């Protein structure tokens, strides 16, 4: 050992590494500060270990301790050196790992000692990768420190390469800590500066235009009125005016104004200024004369291009160049020499309408070129297109209309103001001229969608928020976004489907969009922020406004890129698109809620009458703001209708206060809706619309003031709904308490039946006035010990079962800015310690009573630590320690300070801190940190405990107990969630998963509940109940737990203590009714439970007499909680920490945060994993969206399984399509017999039949059957044993045309006469011993008489289609008389081809005919050899029971394929174990019953190289349906029946016909090609079992009646019949688990487990066993009590010798002994009456070794052998007690053999001692 100097700055002082070094008994000196070269901490030091050290050691220290300074770096060096290594490992996509290296004089450039490779997942957050890396570097140290300190590791130098990163290089990506890895990279690809990007722009617009004029010179360029201009004509004319302009003094970057109207000369003038070298300044001729003069002076334009009509509008301010004067055009028509560069200005357009007069935005040539070169290929603009010059030329909308289409050869069409505003005439012009593409502003576009257009193919819109997508046209709709400072637009989106917020799209060419926060840092995907624009669109800036240019056009402080502040809020969507979220200044406060008014307009325009809408947020002089909803409709809409239409999806404050009807929205001269031209409302004096009905009396006024105090709404109306205007459960109790001071009593349920003041008055009329119903809480006097509450006694008892448990520790974290004083927080916390007695309360136990003791003062543990982002969790973890309830304070605090935040953490116990106590602790701490004075407390918790304990003696408490004792009586429901194997003991290890409900859906949830007199909790509880029901196999009742506030006395809502109470909720789900009906039923069961909510949970368990199990929590196993919105801002920034604990199997907590819902899924990690919970979270979201949109839909119509799961099930299971030859099996025989007539086909006994001999004899009987009246789909019955004649009959039946119906010859006459009639058949092909057995039914032939054959040996003609019957197999199933399954040829062919693809029987192979032909399995043996042209070895009749004969057939005939039903394979492998004969066997195909798990190794040990296969299939699916290949080294927990065969499909549905997900059980259904036509002469049963289903799209499915479940692998698991199911209080059980112990018992070879209903009806768990030993009940019970719990412990164990199998080898559950019988059981104890028995008990105790022997104990049960009896009889003989060893077998007990053991009386009278002499 040696001294170690541990250097850490951002890690803990007692890390996992430091304390492991102390376990090895090292002296670990810890120094967190900068160490000097000659310090005391450097003396007598042998090793230096560093872990997150934030300083650089001196160069002397590195050399003085060279080879002795070890560093722990969580990065795979040389990659990611320096600071923040784990983040840069993910962002730069470097290799991942951890490194323990040596320290040199640089940053992480030392020789590596040990290095491991870590793996991060795509769905892991960055914080998750931080913990996973910190653990690896700590585990790597623990694993290798001994090898390091002992020199058993040679340092190897770092390989070449790697990255180096410093501090503050991450400041741009600070918000992305909770972002997944795949989303972090997705943002990188979407926002990182591209390497090479695109080619740099090197052209101006007039350069590219002049090149297009050379390409399409005679194409039509511009069309105005009826005249037209070609590209050459337009080019030459502009060149003429440009020569004049340049000669007049036009230089590059000069600004030439243009004041013309939309005409051909406008296009000429624009191109002329460009060709001259300047930039055109568009001035609308209709502007005010002051606006015109402002632009001319601001632009400093010396030349103005106008005509004579608008000439005087300049007032002689410029050199007027008339566009109609011929002298203004020169004679030179050639292109001018180029004097411009791509950096020169191309146009200047002024924008305004707000702050400032007007600002001149300057755009350059490269800006416009980049847009036009993106516009043409994006929309496919060709010279065949025709565009519309719609927008005013003073705005970039015209730049898109003109410049983009000119560079593609298209034609421009000028729009006069006669059609610019009459959109009906514009649609006429477009349809009659062929206008194919154009840009229309948002307002004009939405009013153009109604017109019937056939000309447009692409219509682009933008400017305002697009909401309308339905249009009367065949054109594609595009939505664009972009400021005027950038070129026209920067993002484009094709509107493909309806959207709530239509995205603005993805950036264009050479353009990148960033979503940044206020600190200019990158926001994660989905997080809102300010939109920034980078790329070639950013112009120069504003004209003569350099301050505003430097304000909006900024270079980024870190990325070093020029960006434009848009002032708009947007977020990135996961698809890569951007969506507009509003302007950063248009956020207004309505009723105390910050809302975006743009979120109201889409719902209002969805009204069937509203076409346009705009919601403004005006204000009054008092300061309050009100929302006004302007709408354009054909006529006015009543105020109540618009209030109701928006009340379906929006809250009350988002419903506008007033609505204004408009006929046409006033547009500005620029295409936008004139917002300041909308009519201001007249009633703007705090008017409450019109639904306001003023209070008419003194009670309605008194109720309106109480409602105003609780809800915070001024002037309430008597018709206002409580829940609709912010009403909550807490606010209902506040209304009740506020009425108690008035004197009126209101119950909690009566508010939901009287939700308005109008109804509340009518209820409070009969209610008495001033009575003082509420009594004040009496403050207890000072005592030594105080009383504890019922919940405090429970929480105490909980913490006592494991005194070191943190399962009830309450840990929260708040992230403060670094500017907050750490000690100021500690002082505020120490003030809260004395303010509340709970923070100074200690709990002890006086005898058997738990009492509380108050302490005057207690010191607070405030641990200040320094940490990094990637270590805050590990630091906080090491602080969560168990609490001693006898010591105060029950709360520990501390602040972890990082380089960017101060993380305050506090850990308390649930005995003190509950839901409301957290809210009060937040408000008081926030006020103390704000230096606000607090009013001292008035009440204490110790006094409420006294008041409540006395209420436990009242009559109302007994009345509430009687509720729970009757509510929870009888058999309660059982919720079997699809969990993993439940551990024997209850486990508390857990994890969480979070699901966010967006604000929009949250608003629709709360508006729905309030509209139907429900709370959000009632609505969520119904969805949770349905969600649990559908997972519990669509049960009708469910059970779950909930949490109430438990604040009984109204004076306790300001105290700090444990008040919450747990309530069981027994709810019912009616799947046949609507979602609204179930909503009322959940409330009808919740309100009576809340009326009895103040009975402690442990008393409720006692009243119900709930039995305690080990695997499940008592009563319920799923918990559902819900908290309200945070009261303060500090509570909203608090974060609840879970220390890997799940108190229940599954816990759901709904938290109202950020105007949305954060739903937590706390689950036990032993029952669920990461994948299972993710499925259930998606299913809850799927049910929530279906329910909120289907209020009136039946609950049965809501599906649980998701579409991604349905596609996953299709591929892994039901993708079995394969093309198979349609050649029938009777033709394949005659085809093979033709090619190979002299090949062996059948082998019976020791005789062989060739293909020709077989086919010829088949033809003779066929020709005989043909003339007998055999046609397709005719039935002929067979009565023959296993022989060659049976095979000839079957094939001759098929060749003749009919189907063969197998009948056992040895079947009773009662059975045949049934099939003889049900089938209606006539011919009976029977053998000689069974000819008269048909009783001459009709025409009976003799298969052994040559008269029944013919002489024609030629193949009969083909007379069968693939849809004709091939055989009819009767079932004789349980609970029913035999039914004839009709199988067709194509159905049989698909299975034979399918089984040949998996187990190919080739020509050199053979099959064994051993299954009785009245079973479908035999058919696979009858025809299984034909496809591969093999052979069939017919076993001797009744030789299927002799494993000797079966094994001889496999050896002698080289059989490769064999069928074996289980329970018949076990006797076969029991014969082959002591065998060694050679075998050609390849496949053992098992079918008929469930395969025992122990049989798989038994088969592979007696037969290596074989392929054991478990196969399942009902008779209605021909032969088989699914298969599963079993391997050697395998131990499957059941025997999965596997996946369906080719062209087979299997579905597992519930009781409502919905596909069940993985793990959830249901009914197995078959579908595909090989389905039976139906049941013979039973169309009723055919409809019940062969039903059409939407899964097969109208095609039939066969309902097997078997219970089954999907597995994560995809193989289906057999769970037994749907009927004959055994449950344990609803929670079911698997009998195979009980049959495990029977196999574990070596002497118990085989045994079965079922049930039997007793005389009264209760089924007892009867087990049937056979073995070589005699047991007892007690011995068999104890052997099961190993791991099998008591709820599965059976009872009657009747001993058997063989199992009652039937003809199919399965043990008849009926034929099992019904009334038990030979159930071995023990007797009582002992009573050695006489000393003889006591002597017998002592001698038995010595020989048998049993220290306690009873007089009624069986000799053999205590270890009685034949050797023991001789010892016992010998010891008795030595004390004169004759015992016969034979009697011990007849009388095996002491008392039974006591009268039979006699004495050896030796008399001892002697010979007459009186002797003489």
Ligand X SMILES: *P(=O)(O)OCC(C)(C)[C@@H](O)C(N)=O
Q: Verify binding: residue 1045, ligand X, rule CB under 6 A.
A: yes
Distance from C-alpha of 666 to C-alpha of 886, rounded to nearest angstrom: 74
Contacts of 135 (CB under 8 A, 6+ apart): none
By CB under 6 A, what part of segment 1363-1402 binds ligand X? none
Least Å from the CB of residue 81 to ligand X: 52
Q: Identify which of residues 185 and 1090 has a Cβ nearer to ligand X in the complex.
A: 1090
437, two tokens: 């593409």
Query: Whole-number minimum distance, CB 1119 to ligand X, in Å?
Result: 12
Q: How far is the CB of 644 from ligand X (least distance, A)?
A: 24
Cβ closest to ligand X, residue 488 vs residue 912:
912
Choose between 1045 and 1131: whose C-beta lies nearer to ligand X: 1045
Question: Is residue 299 near ligand X by the rule CB under 6 A?
Answer: no
CB atoms within 10 A of CB 849: 11
Expressed in angstroms, the distance from the first to the final Cα of the chain is 101
Q: Which helix (H) or strand (E) holds 1660?
A: strand 1659-1660
Binding letters toward ligand X, positions 999-1038, x by CB under 6 A: ----------------xxx---------------------
- Taking residue 793's Cβ as centre, other Cβ atoms within 10 Å add up to 19
What is the number of other CB atoms lying within 10 angstroms of the CB of residue 1308?
9
- Residue 953's SS3 state is coil
Q: CB nearer to ligand X: give 729 or 756.
A: 729
Instruction: Identify the bridge partners of residue 100 per DSSP, sorted by sequence position.
Output: 72, 114
Alpha helices in 939-1039 (DSSP H): 941-951, 955-967, 999-1011, 1016-1031
Give whichever of 368 and 1122 is closer to ligand X, judged by the CB atom.
1122
β-pair partners for 1243:
1248, 1433
Output 1136 or 1475, the one with its CB closest to ligand X.
1136
Q: Which is nearer to ligand X, 1017 or 1520 (CB)?
A: 1017
Closest CA to 1422 of 1414, 354, 1350, 1216: 1414
Closest to 1317 (Cα-Cα) out of 1384, 1366, 1377: 1377
Using DSSP's 3-state secondary structure scheme, residue 1784 falls into helix
Residue (845 or 1125) nearer to ligand X, CB: 1125
CA pair distance 1422, 1807, nearest whole angstrom: 94
> Which two structure tokens, joined as six digits, stand for 396?
């970039």
Whole-number Å distance between alpha carbons of 242 and 214? 19
Smallest separation (angstroms) from ligand X to the CB of 1045: 3
The number of beta carbons lying within 10 Å of the beta carbon of residue 1089 is 18
When CB distances to ligand X are compared, the closest residue is 729
Q: Is 298 in the site for ligand X (CB under 6 A)?
A: no
Backbone angles phi, psi at 388, to 5 degrees: -125, 125
> How deeply is 1081 buried, as exposed, middle or buried, from its count of CB atoms within 10 A (0-12, 13-18, 19+)?
middle
Q: Which is nearer to ligand X, 617 or 710 (CB)?
A: 710
Contact flag: residue 729 with ligand X (CB under 6 A): yes
Smallest distance, ligand X to C-beta of residue 916, A: 7
Q: Give the shortest CB-1016-to-ligand X separation in angstroms.
A: 6
Vertex 723 angle, CA 1046 and 702, to 5°: 90
* Shortest CB 486 distance to ligand X, Å: 48
Least gap, CB of 496 to ligand X (angstroms): 40
By beta-carbon proximity to ligand X, the closer residue of 306 and 1015 is 1015
| Smallest separation (angstroms) from ligand X to the CB of 1141 | 21
Q: Is 1044 in the site for ligand X (CB under 6 A)?
A: yes
CA 225, 231, 233, 239 torsion-angle sign = positive
Q: Which is nearer to ligand X, 736 or 1496 (CB)?
A: 736
CB of 1509 to ligand X, least distance (A): 56
* Contact (CB, 8 A) for 740 and 773: yes
Site string for ligand X, 536-575 (x = CB under 6 A): ----------------------------------------
987/1143 Cα distance (integer angstroms):
9
Owner of token pair 């493909």 = 496
Give me the least distance between CB of 1161 and ligand X, in Å please: 18
Query: CB of residue 1151 vs ligand X: minimum separation in angstroms?
Result: 12
As a whole number of angstroms, the distance between CA 1145 and CA 309 comes to 84
Q: Which is nearer to ligand X, 1010 or 1103 (CB)?
A: 1010
CB nearer to ligand X: give 409 or 1041: 1041
Least spacing, CB of residue 1149 vs ligand X, in Å:
10
Residue whose CB is less far from ligand X, 1152 or 1199: 1152
Cβ distance to ligand X smaller for residue 464 or 1045: 1045
CB of 953 to ligand X, least distance (A): 24
Contact between 1434 and 1242 (Cβ < 8 Å): yes
Distance CA 1630, CA 1522 (A): 22
| Total residues at interface with ligand X (CB under 6 A) | 7
Q: How far is the CB of 1146 from ligand X (least distance, A)?
A: 18
**Which residue, 1059 or 1316, has its beta carbon nearer to ligand X?**
1059
By CB under 6 A, the residues from 1098 to 1127 that bind ligand X are 1122
Residue of 246, 230, 251, 488 whose CA lies nearest to 351: 488
- H/E element, 445: helix 442-446
What gap in Å lies between CA 368 and CA 383, rounded to an integer? Answer: 20
Q: Is 394 in the site for ligand X (CB under 6 A)?
A: no
Near ligand X in 653-692, by CB under 6 A: none
Among 680, 595, 567, which Cα is nearest to 630's? 680
Whole-number Å distance between alpha carbons of 1233 and 1252? 5
> 1347-1366: which residues touch ligand X (CB under 6 A)?
none
Q: Is 1485 exposed, middle or buried (0-12, 13-18, 19+ CB in 10 A)?
A: buried
Strand partners, 893: 862, 906
Strands ordered across the beta sheet of 1646-1649: 1646-1649, 1663-1666, 1693-1696
1119-1178 residues in contact with ligand X (CB under 6 A) are: 1122
Would you say 403 and 391 are in contact if contact means Cβ atoms under 8 Å apart?
Answer: no
Question: Whose Cβ is closer to ligand X: residue 522's or residue 1016's?
Answer: 1016
**Residue 277 and residue 251 in contact, taking contact as beta carbons nearer than 8 Å:** yes
Residue 838 beta carbon to ligand X: minimum distance, rounded to whole angstroms: 18
CA 1120, CA 1445: separation in Å to the nearest integer? 64
Q: Distance between CA 225 and CA 416 in Å, rounded?
A: 8
- Closest separation between CB of residue 799 and ligand X, Å? 23
**Least separation in angstroms between CB 1088 and ligand X:** 14
The residue (of 388 and 1122) whose beta carbon lies closer to ligand X is: 1122
Q: Binding residues for ligand X, per CB under 6 A?
A: 729, 1015-1017, 1044-1045, 1122
């Amino acid at each position: 050992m040696g001294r170690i100097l541990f250097l850490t700055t951002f890690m803990s002082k007692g890390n996992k590494v430091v304390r492991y070094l102390e376990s090895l008994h090292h002296e670990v000196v810890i120094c967190q500060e900068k160490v000097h070269a000659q310090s005391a901490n450097l003396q007598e030091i042998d090793w230096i270990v560093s872990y997150a050290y934030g300083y650089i050691l001196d160069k002397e220290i590195v050399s003085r301790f060279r080879g002795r300074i070890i560093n722990l770096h969580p990065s795979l060096l040389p990659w990611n050196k320096g600071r923040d290594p784990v983040f840069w490992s993910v962002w730069d996509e470097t290799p991942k790992g951890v490194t323990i290296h040596l320290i040199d004089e640089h940053v992480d450039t030392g020789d590596i000692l040990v290095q491991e490779e870590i793996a991060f997942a795509d769905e892991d957050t960055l914080l998750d990768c931080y913990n996973k890396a910190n653990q690896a570097i700590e585990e790597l140290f623990i694993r290798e420190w001994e090898n390091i300190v002992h020199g058993r590791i040679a340092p190897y130098r770092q390989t070449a390469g790697g990255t180096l990163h410093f501090k503050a290089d991450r400041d741009f990506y600070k918000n992305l800590n909770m972002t997944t890895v795949r989303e972090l990279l997705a943002l990188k690809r979407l926002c990182a500066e591209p390497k090479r990007g695109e080619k740099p722009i090197d052209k101006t617009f007039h350069q590219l235009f002049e090149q297009q004029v050379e390409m399409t010179p005679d194409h039509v360029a511009v069309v105005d009125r009826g005249q037209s201009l070609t590209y050459k004509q337009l080019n030459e004319r502009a060149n003429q005016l440009a020569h004049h302009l340049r000669g007049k003094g036009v230089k590059p970057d000069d600004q030439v104004a243009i004041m013309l109207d939309k005409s051909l000369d406008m296009i000429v003038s624009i191109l002329a200024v460009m060709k001259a070298g300047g930039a055109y300044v568009p001035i609308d001729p209709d502007y005010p004369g002051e606006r015109i003069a402002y632009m001319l002076a601001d632009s400093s334009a010396a030349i103005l291009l106008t005509n004579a009509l608008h000439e005087e509008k300049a007032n002689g301010a410029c050199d007027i160049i008339d566009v109609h004067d011929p002298d203004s055009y020169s004679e030179n028509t050639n292109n001018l020499p180029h004097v411009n560069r791509p950096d020169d200005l191309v146009y200047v357009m002024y924008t305004s309408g707000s702050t400032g007069l007007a600002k001149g935005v300057m755009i350059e040539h490269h800006n416009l070129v980049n847009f036009c070169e993106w516009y043409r290929p994006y929309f496919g603009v060709t010279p065949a297109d025709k565009a519309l010059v719609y927008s005013s030329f003073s705005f970039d909308g015209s730049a898109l209309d003109i410049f983009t289409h000119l560079l593609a050869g298209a034609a421009l069409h000028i729009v006069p103001s006669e059609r610019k505003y009459d959109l009906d005439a514009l649609n006429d012009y477009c349809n009659q001229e062929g206008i194919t593409i154009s840009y229309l502003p948002t307002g004009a576009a939405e009013q153009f969608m109604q017109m019937d257009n056939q000309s447009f193919r692409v219509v682009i819109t933008g400017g305002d928020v697009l909401k309308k997508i339905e249009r009367n046209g065949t054109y594609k709709l595009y939505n664009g976004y972009g400021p005027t400072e950038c070129t026209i637009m920067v993002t484009m989106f094709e509107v493909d489907k309806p959207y709530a917020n239509i995205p603005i799209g993805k950036p264009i060419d050479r353009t990148r969009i960033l979503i940044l926060d206020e600190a200019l840092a990158l926001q994660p995907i989905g997080v809102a922020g300010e939109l920034f624009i980078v790329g070639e669109g950013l112009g120069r800036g504003y004209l003569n406004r350099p301050e505003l240019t430097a304000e909006k056009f900024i270079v980024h402080p870190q990325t070093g890129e020029r960006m434009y502040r848009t002032g708009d809020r947007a977020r990135f969507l996961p698809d890569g698109n951007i969506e507009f979220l509003g302007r950063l200044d248009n956020l207004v406060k309505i009723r105390g809620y910050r809302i975006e008014p743009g979120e109201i307009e889409p719902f209002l325009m969805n009204h069937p009458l509203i076409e346009l809408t705009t919601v403004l947020a005006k204000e009054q002089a008092d300061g309050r703001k009100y929302l006004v909803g302007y709408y354009v409709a054909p006529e006015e809409i009543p105020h109540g209708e618009l209030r109701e239409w928006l009340g379906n999806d929006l809250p009350d404050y988002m419903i506008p206060t007033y609505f204004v009807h408009m006929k046409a929205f006033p547009l500005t001269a620029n295409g936008k809706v004139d917002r300041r031209a909308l009519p201001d409302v007249q009633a703007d004096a705090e008017l409450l619309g019109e639904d306001y009905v003023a209070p008419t009396d003194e009670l309605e006024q008194q109720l309106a003031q109480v409602w105003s105090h609780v809800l915070g709404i001024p002037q309430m109306g008597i018709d206002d709904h409580f829940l609709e205007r912010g009403g909550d459960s807490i606010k209902v109790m506040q209304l009740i308490h506020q009425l108690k001071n008035i004197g009126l009593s209101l119950r909690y349920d009566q508010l939901f039946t009287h939700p308005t003041i109008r109804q509340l008055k009518r209820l409070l009329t009969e209610q008495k006035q001033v009575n003082g119903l509420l009594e004040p809480l009496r403050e207890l006097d000072e005592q030594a010990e105080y009383e504890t509450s019922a919940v405090e006694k429970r929480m105490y008892i909980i913490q006592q079962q494991d005194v070191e448990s943190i399962a009830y520790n309450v840990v929260y974290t708040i992230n403060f800015p670094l500017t907050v004083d750490t000690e100021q927080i500690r002082v505020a916390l120490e003030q809260l310690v004395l303010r509340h007695e709970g923070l100074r309360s200690t709990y002890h136990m006086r005898g058997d009573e738990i009492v509380k003791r108050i302490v005057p003062r207690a010191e607070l543990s405030f641990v200040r630590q320094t940490g990094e982002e990637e270590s805050v969790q590990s630091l906080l973890a090491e602080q969560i320690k168990p609490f001693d309830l006898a010591k105060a304070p029950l709360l520990r605090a501390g602040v972890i300070e990082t380089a960017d935040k101060k993380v305050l953490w506090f850990d308390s116990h649930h005995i003190l801190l509950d839901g409301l106590s957290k809210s009060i602790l937040a408000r008081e701490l926030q006020a103390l940190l704000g230096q606000q004075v607090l009013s001292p407390v008035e009440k204490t918790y110790k006094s409420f405990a006294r008041w409540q304990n006395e209420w436990f003696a009242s009559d109302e408490y007994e009345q509430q107990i009687a509720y729970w004792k009757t509510l929870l009586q009888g058999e309660l429901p059982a919720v079997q969630l699809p969990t993993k194997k439940r551990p024997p003991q209850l486990t508390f290890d857990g994890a969480i998963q979070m699901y966010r409900v967006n604000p929009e859906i949250t608003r629709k949830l709360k508006a729905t509940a309030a509209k139907h007199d429900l709370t959000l909790y009632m609505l969520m509880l119904t969805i949770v109940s349905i969600w649990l029901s559908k997972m519990n196999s669509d049960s009708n009742q469910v059970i779950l737990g909930t949490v109430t506030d438990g604040r009984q006395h109204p004076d306790t809502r300001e105290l700090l203590g444990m008040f919450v109470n747990t309530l069981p909720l027994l709810l019912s789900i009616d799947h046949e009714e609507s979602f609204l009906h179930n909503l009322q039923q959940v409330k009808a069961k919740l309100l009576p439970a809340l009326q009895n909510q103040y009975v402690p949970f442990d008393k409720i368990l006692e009243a119900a007499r709930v039995k305690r199990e080990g695997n499940r929590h008592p009563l319920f196993d799923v918990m559902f909680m819900m908290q309200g919105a945070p009261e303060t801002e500090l509570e909203s920034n608090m974060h609840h920490i879970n220390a890997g604990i799940s108190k229940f199997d599954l816990t759901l907590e709904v938290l109202e945060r950020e105007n949305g819902l954060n739903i937590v899924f706390e689950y036990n990690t032993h029952l669920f994993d990461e994948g299972m919970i993710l499925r259930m979270v998606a299913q809850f979201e799927h049910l929530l969206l279906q329910a909120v949109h289907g209020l009136d839909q039946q609950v049965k119509r809501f599906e649980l399984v998701t579409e991604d799961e349905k596609r996953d099930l299709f591929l892994r299971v039901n993708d079995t399509a394969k093309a198979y030859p349609n050649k029938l099996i009777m033709s394949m025989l005659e085809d093979w017999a033709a090619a190979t007539p002299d090949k062996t086909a059948l082998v019976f006994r020791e005789q062989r039949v060739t293909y020709r001999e077989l086919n010829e004899r088949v033809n003779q009987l066929a020709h005989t059957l043909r003339e007998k009246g055999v046609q397709p789909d005719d039935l002929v019955m067979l009565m023959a044993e296993r022989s060659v004649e049976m095979m000839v009959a079957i094939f001759a039946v098929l060749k003749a045309g009919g189907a063969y119906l197998p009948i056992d010859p040895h079947s009773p006459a009662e059975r045949i006469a049934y099939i003889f009639a049900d089938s209606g058949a006539k011919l009976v092909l029977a053998q000689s011993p069974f000819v008269e057995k048909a009783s001459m039914a009709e025409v009976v032939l003799d298969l052994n008489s040559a008269s029944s054959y013919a002489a024609d040996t030629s193949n009969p003609p083909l007379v069968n289609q693939p849809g004709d019957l091939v055989y009819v197999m009767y079932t004789s199933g349980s609970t029913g008389k035999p039914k004839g399954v009709m199988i067709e040829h194509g159905a049989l062919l698909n299975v034979l081809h399918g089984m040949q693809d998996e187990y190919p029987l080739l020509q050199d192979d053979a099959f064994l005919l051993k299954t009785t032909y009245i079973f479908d399995i035999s058919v696979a043996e009858i025809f299984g050899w034909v496809p591969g042209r093999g052979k069939l070895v017919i076993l001797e009749p009744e030789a299927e029971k002799n494993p000797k004969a079966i094994w001889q057939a496999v050896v002698g005939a080289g059989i490769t394929h064999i069928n074996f039903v289980p329970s018949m394979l076990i006797p076969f492998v029991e014969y082959l174990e002591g065998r060694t004969e050679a075998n050609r066997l390849r496949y053992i195909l098992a079918c008929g019953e469930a395969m025992p798990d122990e049989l798989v190794p038994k088969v592979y040990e007696v037969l290596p190289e074989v392929k054991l296969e478990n196969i399942y299939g009902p008779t209605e699916a021909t032969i088989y349906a699914s298969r599963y290949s079993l391997a050697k080294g395998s131990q499957e927990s059941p025997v999965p029946i596997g996946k369906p065969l080719p062209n087979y499909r299997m579905y597992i549905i519930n009781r409502h016909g919905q596909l069940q997900p993985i793990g959830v059980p249901g009914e197995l259904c078959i579908a595909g090609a090989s389905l039976a036509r139906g049941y013979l002469n039973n169309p009723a049963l055919t409809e019940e079992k062969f039903t059409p289903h939407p899964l097969e799209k109208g095609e039939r499915i066969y309902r097997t009646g078997d219970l089954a479940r999907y597995r994560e692998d995809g193989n289906i698991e057999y769970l037994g019949r749907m009927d004959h199911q055994v449950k344990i209080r609803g929670y079911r059980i698997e009998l195979d688990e009980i049959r495990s112990k029977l196999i574990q018992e070596e002497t118990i070879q085989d045994a079965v487990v079922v049930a039997r209903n007793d005389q009264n009806g209760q089924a007892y768990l009867c087990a049937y066993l056979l073995s070589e030993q005699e047991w007892t009940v007690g011995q068999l019970r104890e052997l099961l009590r190993r791991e099998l719990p008591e709820y599965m412990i059976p009872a009657h164990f009747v001993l058997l010798k063989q199992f009652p199998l039937t003809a199919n080898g399965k043990l008849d559950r009926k034929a099992l002994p019904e009334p038990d019988g030979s159930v071995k059981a023990e007797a009582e104890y002992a009573a050695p009456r006489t000393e003889l028995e006591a002597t017998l008990a002592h001698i038995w105790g010595e020989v048998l070794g049993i220290e306690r022997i009873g007089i009624r104990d069986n000799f053999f049960e205590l270890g009685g052998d034949s050797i023991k009896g001789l010892q016992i009889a010998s010891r008795l003989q030595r004390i004169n007690w004759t015992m016969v060893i034979n009697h011990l077998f007849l009388y095996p007990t002491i008392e039974q053999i006591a009268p039979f053991v006699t004495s050896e009386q030796v008399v001892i009278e002697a010979a007459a001692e009186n002797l003489y002499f």
